[PDB]
Amino acid sequence: RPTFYRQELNKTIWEVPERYQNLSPVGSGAYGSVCAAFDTKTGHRVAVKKLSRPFQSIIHAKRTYRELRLLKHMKHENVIGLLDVFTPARSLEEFNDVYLVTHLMGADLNNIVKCQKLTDDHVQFLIYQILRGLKYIHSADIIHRDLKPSNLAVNEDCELKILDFGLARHTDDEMTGYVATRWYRAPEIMLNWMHYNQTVDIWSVGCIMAELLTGRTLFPGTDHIDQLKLILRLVGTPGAELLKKISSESARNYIQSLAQMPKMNFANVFIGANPLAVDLLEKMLVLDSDKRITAAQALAHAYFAQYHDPDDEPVADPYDQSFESRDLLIDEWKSLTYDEVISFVPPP
Ligand SMILES: NC(=O)COc1ccccc1
Ligand SMILES: [Cl-]
Ligand SMILES: [Cl-]
Ligand SMILES: [Cl-]
Ligand SMILES: [Cl-]
Ligand SMILES: [Cl-]
Ligand SMILES: [Mg+2]
């Protein structure tokens, strides 16, 4: 067991191993608090997150367990990994607080998409990295659900990592109105059309790729209905084949109230873009999720010929998510989480 020290950081008592120095607040909210620190063991600048009320209800205890399980699994160059997890508790009986440690991220995609002038070569390398990470995430049967520029960390050398695993499900209020939290969502999950699957993430990658090419949000809807009208004007209204797959009768009825529209010519929307980029956007932004390109198929598309290496695009170890259908008490989720804290092995 390392030695711990205590300090008060903006209203909060932090108790952390001596290896972590120069703690300074960076973020706060319902979920808890984040501090930047220097890790003397590794030489890395790190983010240390102290969870708030990790075991306060069945829903919160299960959420805590889910985040720790996901962060412990993800071992890929283009995905968030866990550097450390700790508790000052010396037994299950005194266990209350959980702290998570990862690499300190500076800029997100927004910080470079809004400001920098991006070459076609920059768009190739950024989208290649997102798809390389997604091939890994999807091989473990994990669905991200929330890919968007603020969830993509990018460094001075244009190297990218995917963020946001096991946090609180987004609220109805958070998805209302003129909000970036909805603009990247696949229509079938935005409107609850059907049981969704991993193909939702490929819609989001298409929305990100269009915005890097134009500098403009692809579907900046003022509300769910305005956003659907923007989507259908570009990709066309659904045909009989997709309408049958909308399990919701009310959603099927509303779609059929809209005048039919053909798919638009993407070379006339994305004026001047690399023809290979235009071709890839046509294969991602397909209304029927069954017909979208997969991450593994997209890596082999000619747009990425300069970066693609089928011997350096790895898949994940199997991920057992049977806990997701399990009904347990608060203390049972707390005991499972404690076992995962004490069993942690740090990266080489
Ligand atoms: N769960 C996430 O995606 C982010 O989690 C962390 C964020 C900061 C420090 C540690 C963990
Ligand atoms: Cl230490
Ligand atoms: Cl990482
Ligand atoms: Cl504790
Ligand atoms: Cl965003
Ligand atoms: Cl597993
Ligand atoms: Mg999110």
UniProtKB/Swiss-Prot annotation:
UniProt keyword annotation of Transferase present: yes
Tissues expressing this chain: Macrophages, monocytes, T- and B-lymphocytes. Isoform 2 is specifically expressed in kidney and liver.
A GO molecular-function descriptor: protein phosphatase binding
Disulfide bond annotation, renumbered to this chain: none
EC number(s) recorded for this UniProt protein: 2.7.11.24
Reactions mediated catalytically: L-seryl-[protein] + ATP = O-phospho-L-seryl-[protein] + ADP + H(+); L-threonyl-[protein] + ATP = O-phospho-L-threonyl-[protein] + ADP + H(+)
Effect of residue 178 to F: Phosphorylation blocked
An annotated GO BP: placenta development
Domain Protein kinase, first and last residues per copy: 20-304
Keywords attached to this entry: Acetylation, Apoptosis, ATP-binding, Cytoplasm, Kinase, Nucleotide-binding, Nucleus, Phosphoprotein, Serine/threonine-protein kinase, Stress response, Transcription, Transcription regulation, Transferase, Ubl conjugation
Modified residues (N6-acetyllysine): 49, 148
Xref: CDD domains: STKc_p38alpha
Gene3D superfamilies reported for this sequence: Phosphorylase Kinase, domain 1, Transferase(Phosphotransferase) domain 1
Domain of life: Eukaryota
Motif (TXY): 176-178
Top EC class of this enzyme: transferase
Active site per UniProt: 164
Function: Serine/threonine kinase which acts as an essential component of the MAP kinase signal transduction pathway. MAPK14 is one of the four p38 MAPKs which play an important role in the cascades of cellular responses evoked by extracellular stimuli such as pro-inflammatory cytokines or physical stress leading to direct activation of transcription factors. Accordingly, p38 MAPKs phosphorylate a broad range of proteins and it has been estimated that they may have approximately 200 to 300 substrates each.
Family: Belongs to the protein kinase superfamily. CMGC Ser/Thr protein kinase family. MAP kinase subfamily.
Protein name, per record: Mitogen-activated protein kinase 14
Organism: Mus musculus
Source species taxonomy: Eukaryota, Metazoa, Chordata, Craniata, Vertebrata
